[PDB]
Amino acid sequence: STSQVRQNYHQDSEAAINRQINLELYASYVYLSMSYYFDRDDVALKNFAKYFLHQSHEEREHAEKLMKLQNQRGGRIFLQDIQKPDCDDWESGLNAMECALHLEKNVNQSLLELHKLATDKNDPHLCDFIETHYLNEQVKAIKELGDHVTNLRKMGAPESGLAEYLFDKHTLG
Amino acid sequence: STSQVRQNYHQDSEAAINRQINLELYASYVYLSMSYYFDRDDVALKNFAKYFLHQSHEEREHAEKLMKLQNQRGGRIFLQDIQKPDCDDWESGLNAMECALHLEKNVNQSLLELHKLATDKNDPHLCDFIETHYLNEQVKAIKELGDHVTNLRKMGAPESGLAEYLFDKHTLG
Amino acid sequence: STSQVRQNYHQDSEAAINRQINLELYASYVYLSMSYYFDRDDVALKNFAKYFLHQSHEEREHAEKLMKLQNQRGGRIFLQDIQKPDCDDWESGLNAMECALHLEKNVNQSLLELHKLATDKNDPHLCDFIETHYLNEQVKAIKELGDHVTNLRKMGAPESGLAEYLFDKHTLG
Amino acid sequence: STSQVRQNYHQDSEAAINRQINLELYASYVYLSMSYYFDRDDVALKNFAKYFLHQSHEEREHAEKLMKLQNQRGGRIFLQDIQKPDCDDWESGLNAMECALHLEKNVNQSLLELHKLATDKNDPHLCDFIETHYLNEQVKAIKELGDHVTNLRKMGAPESGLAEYLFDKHTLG
Amino acid sequence: STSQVRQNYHQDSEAAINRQINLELYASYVYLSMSYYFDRDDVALKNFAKYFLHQSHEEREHAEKLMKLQNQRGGRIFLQDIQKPDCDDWESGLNAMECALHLEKNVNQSLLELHKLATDKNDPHLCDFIETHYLNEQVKAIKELGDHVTNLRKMGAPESGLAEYLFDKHTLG
Amino acid sequence: STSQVRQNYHQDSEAAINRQINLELYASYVYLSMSYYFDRDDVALKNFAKYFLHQSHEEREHAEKLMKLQNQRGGRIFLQDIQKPDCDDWESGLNAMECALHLEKNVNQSLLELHKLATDKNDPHLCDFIETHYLNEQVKAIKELGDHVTNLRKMGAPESGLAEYLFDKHTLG
Numbered sequence A, B, C, D, E, F: 001s002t003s004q005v006r007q008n009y010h011q012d013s014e015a016a017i018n019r020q021i022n023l024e025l026y027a028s029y030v031y032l033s034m035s036y037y038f039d040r041d042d043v044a045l046k047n048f049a050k051y052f053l054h055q056s057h058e059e060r061e062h063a064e065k066l067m068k069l070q071n072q073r074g075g076r077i078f079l080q081d082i083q084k085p086d087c088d089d090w091e092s093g094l095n096a097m098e099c100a101l102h103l104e105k106n107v108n109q110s111l112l113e114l115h116k117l118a119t120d121k122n123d124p125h126l127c128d129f130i131e132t133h134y135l136n137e138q139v140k141a142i143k144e145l146g147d148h149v150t151n152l153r154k155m156g157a158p159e160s161g162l163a164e165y166l167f168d169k170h171t172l173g
């Protein structure tokens, strides 16, 4: 049953990777939902839509890299259902950016737990993988989303509809 | 509540589109699963892996086009959970191609039902959308998968391991 | 006696680096041996020969990078005899790939021990060096060799002489 | 008061980053001082001057990267006075290179303490940042300065004025 | 003790140049502080950040040119501590621009005093240096900052958060 | 047991080739050792290091050409341990060049014995191989090393540290 390639790869690490795959796929689905909210005729913020669609595709790439890792290490991928997002209607550009920030911080927390597990199981390859490919990407994403939230709030969103319009044009365009 | 853009778009059509979105996303997940099966060190068929990953990405594009349609017509997207695929281990190149063929025929059946609904609701735009973007793509996919299954069977798959190897190289490479 | 550059570099780490240098040079010699086995007129698998010669040269580069590290840190290189490989005749493409896989896993185990030592001696530079330059390279090598072994076995090697021929052409060519 | 972006970032880490910023800015000032010493009409070693000015600019870049990190993590930058360098007159090319080596080793020691703190506070992002951007740069700098000191000493500096002249031309030019 | 190059260069002029070096380095530090304030996640004005960072680098260049002058004339550079800026938190784009304007006027006043000293000591080279390299640069800087302050005030800064956003985009971008 | 290709290839010749392979690999290891001696922070002669590393790689190529010959003729390669070099510390550029000259003359003597054996066994192909690929290369190498030794001695090495520095720059650079 043990893979010919497997070396220094704990069952707990393998399980945590499978959980992370699901979380990344979930995040991709959330961003997809947000994207198409902004594409609605009654919302009509094209650059918000583009921004979130890009994020969706990036999360899918992150999931696929974890799947690749699992196989590289001789673990076995077990997929689970991808839960639907928490909202159908994301309310506003500001509300979506705030929800994105919350999601990114949740993903980051999971990655930090995975890193801790890798370190505890003396799996330096896995720890390095997470550091190299995931942790700075998350810090950057969180900082960007925080910047966006700050700007939208300062401009008068979400009650000032001119604010979201201009942010869409000048920041996200 | 009715969208400013909505015209000649039945509630039943809107609901059927939402179901089709889920089915396309499901198909994408199935193909993703198959892809990474072929990437396993104990399977190691890189061009099978590439083939299925391409299919996964294509299905996601199909889902996104339906989401775009929903918004174009003034319907509202309601996402559902994406169910996990039926298998974790796809057994062989031949078995995966057979499962893909079955999936594609199921997707095609759903599209034919959607077309019938559009025609019944006198929605020519929707009927044309399905014909133009979906039905020939499905016929082509089904024909290709059938061709692949035929070739693999004729070559001696899945018991002849040389067969899958050579198919991977010469057909899928 | 202490180098002007030396800082946070334990004697145990210095000794472990010297051992690793020898192991890399040994691995280079093994791969060289395998290469020229495949060049024999009674074996005659040119792409196996090329594959192993490339690996030989890569291992030598790995050894030289460790020598560079030793000097960068102010340690002192002490070379030892390079032991001859365990075989003169490597039997088959499959047997050589299996022996390579075993060797790579042994090298990886040594690197993981070196990383553990670096972490225990609070030498983050050394730990990072190993992670950055060695550990993912080893995981990739192990995965590749496992893939090769799987394919050769599935094709009917080493009793099916057509298998090795075709693998040589299509995978290694 | 807590930043919206802040996650897994200890107050002690934030404080240590602020100290490191000051130390990098200090090092920049030292190198600036050395540069302009070599530009004196009674010293007149242009390539020594260029070498140290480059180092000055590099240290400033290092400080700015730490400031960027502080903000990325949601810490708050607190600047302090930049102390004047220990010397106004650096005596000789050899003496300056020796002083530079001492400075670089002091900076490295501070970075190693920061890495230890990050590891103790289970802050893998910060630890990785230091490893990736700072620790190998310091090892390289220390090795280069040691090489320069060795060459100058071997050539007969600082009593052989021809030595510094020729080193300036052939090594630093 | 007197430099071989020294001619018509008064001790008072030499001392004033040393003071000016410190003031330029101080101004560089102020602008650096302002830059990174605008990079905060709770401020998030990237083009303000860029503007001030550019100014920081320009002030450092100004300091280095004075150091070059000192050596050209046979004076001796004596560096002093670089005092920390007066604020850690610069409040707003408008407040920072106002603080910059005040700083630039203070630097200009010091340069005008230096010019007066040069003229009083019959040092035409020094007077010309200041006129050529410093005085028009200061007048231009002051005019630019005044223009920026006027525009920000007219737009409704700092209470109108849309004002700073749009200024950042359209003037500073 | 006799190779299908073997013709006019004496067992004594086959054995001598195996010995020569080992000697070339030994020489490669010696040069590698010397290279990294010059890379030490307390030696710091980069062009000496480069020179010897080049020689190391050339000797490995020479060994591989002999391995190719062995297989071309239907002999069988038998590898032996590669002995460690006689020194860990090579003392000086001059001492290393003198040791290299001694090594090259020893290698040449072995090649001349191999040529004599080939001629005695009426093996013109082998004799021609040695003449064409080895003997002029050795004469050239010996002449070059002798030239280097002469120049270093004339310049005042190894007691004049300026000599080795300048030789490193002007001859080896």
Ligand code: NA
Pocket: A024, A027, A058, A059, A062, A107
């Ligand atoms: Na992600």
Ligand code: NA
Pocket: B024, B027, B058, B059, B062, B107
């Ligand atoms: Na589809």
Ligand code: NA
Pocket: C024, C027, C058, C059, C062, C107
């Ligand atoms: Na290696």
Ligand code: NA
Pocket: D024, D027, D058, D059, D062, D107
């Ligand atoms: Na630095």
Ligand code: NA
Pocket: E024, E027, E058, E059, E062, E107
């Ligand atoms: Na200035």
Ligand code: NA
Pocket: F024, F027, F058, F059, F062, F107
């Ligand atoms: Na040779």
